[PDB]
Design an enzyme around this catalytic site. Structure first.
Site, PDB file in Angstrom:
ATOM      1  N   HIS A 223      -1.607  -2.108   2.314  1.00  0.00           N
ATOM      2  CA  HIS A 223      -0.944  -3.575   2.023  1.00  0.00           C
ATOM      3  C   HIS A 223      -0.484  -3.429   0.367  1.00  0.00           C
ATOM      4  O   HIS A 223       0.736  -3.905   0.236  1.00  0.00           O
ATOM      5  CB  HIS A 223      -1.452  -4.498   2.299  1.00  0.00           C
ATOM      6  CG  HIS A 223      -0.990  -5.743   1.938  1.00  0.00           C
ATOM      7  ND1 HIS A 223      -0.224  -6.591   2.822  1.00  0.00           N
ATOM      8  CD2 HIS A 223      -1.129  -6.552   0.913  1.00  0.00           C
ATOM      9  CE1 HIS A 223       0.184  -7.613   2.189  1.00  0.00           C
ATOM     10  NE2 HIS A 223      -0.282  -8.010   1.071  1.00  0.00           N
ATOM     11  N   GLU A 224      -1.046  -3.017  -0.654  1.00  0.00           N
ATOM     12  CA  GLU A 224      -0.801  -3.093  -1.960  1.00  0.00           C
ATOM     13  C   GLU A 224       0.004  -2.096  -2.215  1.00  0.00           C
ATOM     14  O   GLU A 224       1.160  -2.334  -3.141  1.00  0.00           O
ATOM     15  CB  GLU A 224      -1.865  -3.252  -2.809  1.00  0.00           C
ATOM     16  CG  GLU A 224      -2.945  -4.617  -2.707  1.00  0.00           C
ATOM     17  CD  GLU A 224      -2.013  -5.708  -2.891  1.00  0.00           C
ATOM     18  OE1 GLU A 224      -1.050  -5.853  -3.892  1.00  0.00           O
ATOM     19  OE2 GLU A 224      -2.169  -6.743  -2.330  1.00  0.00           O
TER      20      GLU A 224
HETATM   21 ZN   LIG Z   1       0.465  -8.948  -0.538  1.00  0.00          ZN
END
Ligand SMILES: [Zn+2]
Length: 851
Positions: A223-224
C-alpha cells in the site's frame, strides 16, 4: 533471494557499497546512520525517524491525542541491535513476498525504473540532478560518495503504526505532482499490525474464525509502495483534494478527511467514488506534464554533474515515461501508451488487487476502520512465510484465513493497548429520561455514518457538444480483471534495470526540507444531540454489558437495559429470554445448553421470502427489532414497512442526486458530400450510447458512495448485534456452570470453547443470509430510486436529438436521395428505445453482481 540479493545482518561490517553509514537531506546537520542497500535504488534505515522532520524528535505521546481510530506509542522500540536486526530481516521478508506475486514483481520494477527527473538546472538547456534526490554514502576510509536512489525505508516516528510516504520538496517545483518525481522515504514497521473485523467472506467461508483478524503487513507495505509509485512518477493527486464529509447530523461522523490519493490507492469501490470529470481532469493534467518533460529533453544540450553521457540519461527517462522517439532524435508522448502507463500506476497497482494475489483476508473498503493493534514476529519461518503469510499450507491455519485470526493463532499476535481511548473522539446522543434530565450515550467517531458532500460530485453533462464526421469514438473502458493484469504482465520488460552511475560529489551535508503539507483543522468533539426517539446506536448499546467482574446478567426485551448494567437487550423472542434466564440445576444443564444452541440457530436462521417488493426476493425480519429500523419495534412492522416503501427505510439519510439538463448535440453540415453526411448521422447515434453510458456511470458513483456505504455499515452493525447476543448467552450459561460445586468436575465436563465455536458458526450462517439481503436492498434502491432519474433525463435528450437528426436528414435530402427513407427509419428506431442498464458494466464487485 530473488529481489533482495544479500542475506543481511545488522552487525555486519560497514563496506561503503551496500552496508554504510549514510547521510540524507537534512534541515540542519545530522549524524550518520547505518543503512543497508537491499536492491538497486532501494535503501533501508533500521532507526526511528527523528531526522527527516526537525519538529519530530520526541518519541513520546503528543499534547493532543490525534484523530485516528488506532494509535500506539513506545519510545523504547527500535533502540536495541536485536530489534534493528529483526526489523531488517522483517522488511526484507516482506519485499520477497511482494515480489513473489505477479503484480508485486511489476510494481517493484516500476519503482526502480521511476528515477526522479534531473530538473535541478536553472539553465533550461542543461540536465542537472536535484540534490535532495540523493544520499551521501560514507566509506571506511573517511571520504563520502553521493548516490542517486528512489526509495528509503525508515522506522516509524512517535506513533509507531502511522505509516506514510515522505519526500523532500523543491523551493519552486512541486516534484510529486509535475511528473518529475522525488526520492521517497517510507515510515514502516514489520513488527506491528492492525486488527480489523470482516464478515463479507462468510459466503465462501462458513467456518470463519471468531474475533479480530490481523492485517498481513505485506499488504500494508504494498500500500505504501503504491503511494511511492505515484510520487516517483509525479502523478500523485494534490493532498488538498480531500473527500469532504457532512458532519452536522447526529448519525454523521464528526469528520474524516480522506484524500482522493488514498481512495485511488485502495481501488475497489473506493476508487469509483471519484467521478469521470475529475478523473479525466487528472489524466489530461499529467499527460501535459509528461509532454513538458518531453520538451525539456528536446531542449537539453549538455549534461553536468556526472561522468555518464547525455545520450544515456535521455534514454533512461525514455524508458521511464515510455516516450516515442524519431530517427531525428526528437522525443514525444504517445497518447495510447501514456494511457497504458497511467492506468497501470493508477488502477492496476491498488491495495485491493494485491489482496487477490496474496489470497488473504483484508478490509474491503477504506471505511472498514481498524479496531486494534498487535505485536507480531514475522521473521521465523514457523510464523510467517514468503508464499503463505500467516496462513501456512498443510496446517490448521490454511483454511478460512485461520492464520490471520487473532484467537486461533494467538501465539503470533499479542494484543497491545490502543492509545486512542474508546471514546476519545465521540458524539453524545441524548434522550428524555424515562427535558429535566437526559440519558446520554457516547458513540465513537468511526461507528458513525460517512455522508459525502455534494461538492465531491461534479459533472459536465450540461455542456453541449458539436458533432462532426471527425468526431472521436471513445473506446469502451475495459474494467479491471486478472486477465487484464495478466496481459500487462506479458508485455512487461523484466530484465534490464537502470544502472547505478557515478555522479559528482555534492556538499558534505545535503540541505533539504520536507514537502509543505496542508494544515488540517481538528474536528469538533463531543457534540450533543437531543433526540425524540431511541436510535440504532442506542439499540446496539443496549446489547452491551461490562465484560469484567459483574455477573448475574439477565437478558430482556426492553431498551431499559441501558439503565441496569445486569440487564442486556435482545431481539430474540420472549421464549428465548424465559429459557436463558431460567435457573437450571446440574442434572438439567447440558440438555439446557444444547437446547439454547438450538434456539440461537433457529432465531438467527429466520428467512422470509417475498415476490411483492421486486429486486428484493428475501427478507430478514429480526433486523427491525435489532436496530430499530424506522422506529417500528415489531418484526411484523419491518416486513410490512419494507414492502410498502422499499429499501429507503433502511437508509439513515436519503442521498441527493442532481442530474442537470443534458447538453444537446449540434450537427455540422457538409454540402455536396454523401459520404461525410452519413458519417455525421452515424457518429451522433453512437455518441448517444456514450451519453447513456456516461449518465449510468455517474449514478453508479453516487450510489456507491452515498448509499452502498450506509448498507455496508448496517451489515457491520448486525454482525456486532449477533456477536453481542452470543456473548450475553455465553456469560449466562457460564455463570450457571460456575454456580455449581464439585459436580462441575466429571458430572458436567463442559467446554466453553465448544459452545463459543458452535455459536460463532450460527452467526456466520445468519450473516450469509444478512449479506444476501442487504446487497439486494442496495441494488434495489439503485434500480428503482436512482436509475429512473437518469433514464427520463436521458429520454428527454433522445427527444432533442430525434428532431435534430430528422431536420438534418431533411436539410440534406438532395445529397442523400437514395438513402433518405433508410436513414429516416434508423433515427426513429434507435432513439425510441432505452439502452438497458447492466450492473456488470460499471461494478466489478462480483458479490454485488450476484443479485
Ligand atoms: Zn495510504
Amino acid at each position: 533471494m530473488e529481489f533482495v540479493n544479500k542475506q543481511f545482518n545488522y552487525k555486519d561490517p560497514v563496506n561503503g557499497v551496500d552496508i554504510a553509514y549514510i547521510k540524507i537531506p537534512n534541515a540542519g546537520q545530522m549524524q550518520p546512520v547505518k543503512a543497508f542497500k537491499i536492491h538497486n535504488k532501494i535503501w533501508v534505515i533500521p532507526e526511528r525517524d527523528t531526522f527527516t522532520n526537525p519538529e519530530e524528535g520526541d518519541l513520546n505521546p503528543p499534547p493532543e491525542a490525534k484523530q485516528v481510530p488506532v494509535s500506539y506509542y513506545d519510545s523504547t522500540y527500535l533502540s536495541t541491535d536485536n530489534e534493528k536486526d529483526n526489523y531488517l530481516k522483517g522488511v526484507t521478508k516482506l519485499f520477497e513476498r511482494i515480489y513473489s506475486t505477479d503484480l508485486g514483481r511489476m510494481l517493484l520494477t516500476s519503482i526502480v525504473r521511476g528515477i526522479p527527473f534531473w530538473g535541478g538546472s536553472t539553465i533550461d538547456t542543461e540536465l542537472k540532478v536535484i540534490d535532495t534526490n540523493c544520499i551521501n554514502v560514507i566509506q571506511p576510509d573517511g571520504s563520502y560518495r553521493s548516490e542517486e536512489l528512489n526509495l528509503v525505508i525508515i522506522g516509524p516516528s512517535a506513533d509507531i503504526i502511522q505509516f506514510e510516504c515522505k519526500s523532500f520538496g523543491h523551493e519552486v517545483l512541486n516534484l510529486t505532482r509535475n511528473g518529475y518525481g522525488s526520492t521517497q522515504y517510507i515510515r514502516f514497521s514489520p513488527d506491528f499490525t492492525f486488527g480489523f473485523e470482516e464478515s463479507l467472506e462468510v459466503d465462501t467461508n462458513p467456518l470463519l474464525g471468531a474475533g479480530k483478524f490481523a492485517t498481513d503487513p505485506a499488504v500494508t507495505l504494498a500500500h505504501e509502495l503504491i503511494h511511492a509509485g505515484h510520487r516517483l512518477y509525479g502523478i500523485a493527486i494534490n493532498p488538498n483534494r480531500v473527500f469532504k464529509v457532512n458532519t452536522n447530523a447526529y448519525y454523521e461522523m464528526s469528520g474524516l478527511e480522506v484524500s482522493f490519493e488514498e481512495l485511488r490507492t485502495f481501488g475497489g469501490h473506493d476508487a469509483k467514488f471519484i467521478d469521470s470529470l475529475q478523473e479525466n481532469e487528472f489524466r489530461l493534467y499529467y499527460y501535459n506534464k509528461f509532454k513538458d518533460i518531453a520538451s525539456t529533453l528536446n531542449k537539453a544540450k549538455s549534461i553536468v554533474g556526472t561522468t555518464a553521457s547525455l545520450q544515456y540519461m535521455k534514454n533512461v527517462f525514455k524508458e521511464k515515461y515510455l516516450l516515442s522517439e524519431d530517427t531525428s532524435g526528437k522525443f514525444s508522448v504517445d497518447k495510447l501508451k501514456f494511457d497504458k502507463l497511467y492506468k497501470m500506476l493508477t488502477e492496476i497497482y491498488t491495495e485491493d488487487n494485491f489482496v487477490k494475489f496474496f489470497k488473504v483476508l483484508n478490509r474491503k473498503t477504506y471505511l472498514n476502520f481498524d479496531k486494534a493493534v498487535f505485536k507480531i514476529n514475522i521473521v521465523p519461518k514457523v510464523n510467517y512465510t514468503i508464499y503463505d503469510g500467516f496462513n501456512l499450507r498443510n496446517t490448521n491455519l490454511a483454511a478460512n484465513f485461520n492464520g490471520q485470526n487473532t484467537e486461533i493463532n494467538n501465539m503470533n499476535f499479542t494484543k497491545l493497548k490502543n492509545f486512542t481511548g474508546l471514546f476519545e473522539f465521540y458524539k453524545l446522543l441524548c434522550v428524555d429520561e424515562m427535558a429535566l434530565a437526559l440519558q446520554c450515550i457516547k458513540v465513537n467517531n468511526w461507528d458513525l455514518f460517512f455522508s459525502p458532500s455534494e461538492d465531491n460530485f461534479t459533472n459536465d453533462l450540461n455542456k453541449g457538444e458539436e458533432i462532426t464526421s471527425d468526431t472521436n469514438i471513445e473506446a469502451a473502458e475495459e474494467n479491471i480483471s486478472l486477465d487484464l493484469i495478466q496481459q500487462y504482465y506479458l508485455t512487461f520488460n523484466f530484465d534490464n534495470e537502470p544502472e547505478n552511475i557515478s555522479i559528482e560529489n555534492l556538499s558534505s551535508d545535503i540541505i533539504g526540507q520536507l514537502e509543505l503539507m496542508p494544515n488540517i483543522e481538528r474536528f469538533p468533539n463531543g457534540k450533543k444531540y437531543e433526540l425524540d426517539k431511541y436510535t440504532m446506536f442506542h439499540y446496539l448499546r443496549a446489547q452491551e454489558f461490562e465484560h469484567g467482574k459483574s455477573r448475574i446478567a439477565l437478558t430482556n426485551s426492553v431498551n431499559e437495559a441501558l439503565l441496569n448494567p445486569s440487564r442486556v437487550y435482545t431481539f430474540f423472542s420472549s421464549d428465548y429470554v424465559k429459557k436463558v434466564n431460567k435457573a437450571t440445576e446440574a442434572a438439567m444443564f447440558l440438555g439446557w445448553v444444547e437446547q439454547l444452541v438450538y434456539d440461537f440457530t433457529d432465531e438467527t436462521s429466520e428467512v422470509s421470502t417475498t415476490d411483492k417488493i421486486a429486486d428484493i426476493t428475501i427478507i430478514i425480519p429480526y433486523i427491525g427489532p435489532a436496530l430499530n429500523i424506522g422506529n417500528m419495534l415489531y418484526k411484523d412492522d419491518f416486513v410490512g414497512a419494507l414492502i410498502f416503501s422499499g429499501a429507503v427505510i433502511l437508509l439513515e439519510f436519503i442521498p441527493e442526486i442532481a442530474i442537470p439538463v443534458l447538453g444537446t448535440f449540434a450537427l455540422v453540415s457538409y454540402i455536396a458530400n454523401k459520404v461525410l453526411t452519413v458519417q455525421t448521422i452515424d457518429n451522433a447515434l453512437s455518441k448517444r450510447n456514450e451519453k447513456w453510458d456516461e449518465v449510468y456511470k455517474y449514478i453508479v458513483t453516487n450510489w456507491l458512495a452515498k448509499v452502498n456505504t450506509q448498507i455496508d455499515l448496517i451489515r457491520k452493525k448486525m454482525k456486532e448485534a449477533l456477536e453481542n447476543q452470543a456473548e450475553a448467552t455465553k456469560a449466562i450459561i457460564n455463570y450457571q456452570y460456575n454456580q455449581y460445586t464439585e459436580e462441575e468436575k466429571n458430572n458436567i465436563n463442559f467446554n466453553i470453547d465448544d459452545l463459543s465455536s458452535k455459536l460463532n458458526e450460527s452467526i456466520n450462517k445468519a450473516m450469509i443470509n444478512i449479506n444476501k439481503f442487504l446487497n439486494q436492498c442496495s441494488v434495489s434502491y439503485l434500480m428503482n430510486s436512482m436509475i429512473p432519474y437518469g433514464v427520463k433525463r436521458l429520454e428527454d435528450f433522445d427527444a432533442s436529438l430525434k428532431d435534430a437528426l430528422l431536420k438534418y436528414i431533411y436539410d440534406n435530402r438532395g445529397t442523400l436521395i437514395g438513402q433518405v427513407d433508410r436513414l429516416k427509419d434508423k433515427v426513429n428506431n434507435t432513439l425510441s428505445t432505452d439502452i438497458p442498464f447492466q450492473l456488470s458494466k460499471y461494478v466489478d464487485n462480483q458479490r454485488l453482481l450476484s443479485t
